[PDB]
Structures are given as C-alpha cells and as structure tokens.
Copies of this chain bind each other. A is one copy, B any other.
Amino acid sequence: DLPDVTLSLCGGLSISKEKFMEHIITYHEFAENPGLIDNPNLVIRIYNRYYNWALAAPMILSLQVFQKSLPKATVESWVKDK
C-alpha cells in the first residue's frame, strides 16, 4: 500500500515527533486555508522523513498521478541537489 503523508506547521527544517504532532494540519484547516501550502513552516512526513513542500511535491505528485513512489535513486538526487 502507498505511503502515508502527514502535514504539520512545525517548522524546524531551517525535528522531534512531539513537535510534529502538536501542529498537525486537519482537513478542515487545509480546506479553510489552502495558502498554507506556501507556508515555510509546513513540514511533510513521508518515507519516515521530514520534508518541506519544495522537496516533497514531486513525491506527492508521483503518488497521486501514477500511484507509485518515485524511485529511491530518484529521491536521493532530487534531495542532494537541493
């Protein structure tokens, strides 16, 4: 089954798990303010790691479009680039 994705406004990339779950974004919060997608404090939990939106967006998009993760070698080069 496909990986879970979790959103939190915890910041800190510029991260403990207590920090992450204290600021988790609900559906209702996102549905009332989609502009949070540009919030630099937005953190994405996927693959047991923490990413900002600019690093997680391809992985999110690949899962929604092809229902398949980006290859592990692909994720490494996308991240070591940035």
Contacts and interface: CB of A to CB of B under 8 A. Distances in A.
B78 A34 contact: yes
Contact of A6 (B27, B37, B65, B68): B65
A60 B62 contact: no
A63 B64 contact: yes
B60 A61 contact: yes
Interface in A11-51: 25, 27, 30-32, 34, 37
Given A30-B62, A31-B70, 20 more contacts: A5-B64, A7-B61, A7-B65, A25-B65, A27-B65, A27-B66, A30-B58, A30-B65, A30-B70, A31-B74, A32-B74, A34-B58, A34-B74, A34-B78, A37-B58, A37-B61, A57-B57, A60-B64, A63-B64, A64-B64
